[PDB]
Amino acid sequence: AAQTNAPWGLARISSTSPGTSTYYYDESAGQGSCVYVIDTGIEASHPEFEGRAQMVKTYYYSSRDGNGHGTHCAGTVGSRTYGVAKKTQLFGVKVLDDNGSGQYSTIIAGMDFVASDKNNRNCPKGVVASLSLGGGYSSSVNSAAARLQSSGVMVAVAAGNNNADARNYSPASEPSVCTVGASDRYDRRSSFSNYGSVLDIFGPGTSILSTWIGGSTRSISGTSMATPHVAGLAAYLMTLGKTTAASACRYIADTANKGDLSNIPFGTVNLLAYNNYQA
Ligand SMILES: [Ca+2]
Known part of the structure; x- marks a missing residue:
């Protein structure tokens, strides 16, 4: 499949070079996989999700995304226009309030929730x-992130936006999960992206167009935007049977664009995350 005039990040993920604008991917598109977006929630009614998104848990008085950032991330995972895995199922877990903040205890509960909740979902491909x-x-x-990973979930986490070594941040510093840095459309490390030995991969993170609340769209930047590219890529690769949750991070690293x-x-x-799709 080919999506013309795709957001630059999608085009990048299916290209050996920067500067192109068409996203190429196997029509399977992550069908039969599921991605949990653990964030401020997801506006599931957004037309871009086509009924494939659902809120499954909140720790606040509503499950509505009153911020937008969870909706944006979910969009990069699996929205029809802005997503990597255009047929995946999206499950929202609201661990962050509408100001984008959350206590670590709530975040931990959300991770343990997902490790159990997957047993209540149909995700035959992973x-x-x-x-x-x-x-x-x-x-x-x-x-908590390690447990989630160990339970059979491919965990992708943002490296952080401090232009610093990610060893000093969590869950970025957990060795067993996939820690994602950000790049820009000219293949530069994003100016804010954390780095260090704990990073596993980079994905598109500067000026990323995706869904937003109120049925809108929005370009924003962060390792938060890079992460869902990798999460979506993992779901896509698992549907293709290329890899599994336990080794998807390794598979993505092994098949990445190198030294670019x-x-x-x-x-x-x-x-740099790459789908290795040959039309
Ligand atoms: Ca790792």
């Missing part, structure tokens, strides 16, 4: 969780 959030180092937050990014500090991987 389960992914996208965590576009973080904070200072916490062994408890890292352990600029301003990658010595000791950080120079790997």
Whole structure:
């Protein structure tokens, strides 16, 4: 399949080079997979989700996304126009309030929720969780992410937006999950992107167009935007049978575009997520 005039990040994920605008992908499109978006929620009624999105849990007085950032992330995972995996099922877990904040204890509960909740969902091709959030180092937050991963969920987490070593942030610093840095449309490391040995992969994170609340759309930037590209890619690859939750991060790293990014500090991987789709 070919989507013309796709957002640059989608085009990038199916290309060996920057500067193109068509997204190429297998028509399977993540059908039969599921992606949990653990965030401010998802506006499931957005036409872009085509009924494939649902809120499954909130820790607040509503499950509505009153912020937009969860909806944006979900859009990059699986919206019809802005998504990587255009036929995946999207499950929203609202661990962040409408100001985008959340206590670590709530975030941890949300991760444990997903590890159990997948047993109540139909995801024959596999389960992914996208965590576009973080904070200072916490062994408890890292352990929660590790449990989620261990339970059979491909966990993708944002590296963080501090232009610093991700070793000092959680869940970014958890070795067993897939930690995602951000790049821009000219293959530069995004100016805000964290880096370090704990990063596994980079994805498009600067100026990313996706869904927003009120049935709208929006371009924003962050490792939060890079993460759902990788989560969506994982779901897509699992539907194709290329990989599994336990080794998707390794598979993505092994099949990535290599050595193409600029301003990658010595000791950080120079790997950009790539679907290796040959039309
Ligand atoms: Ca890792």
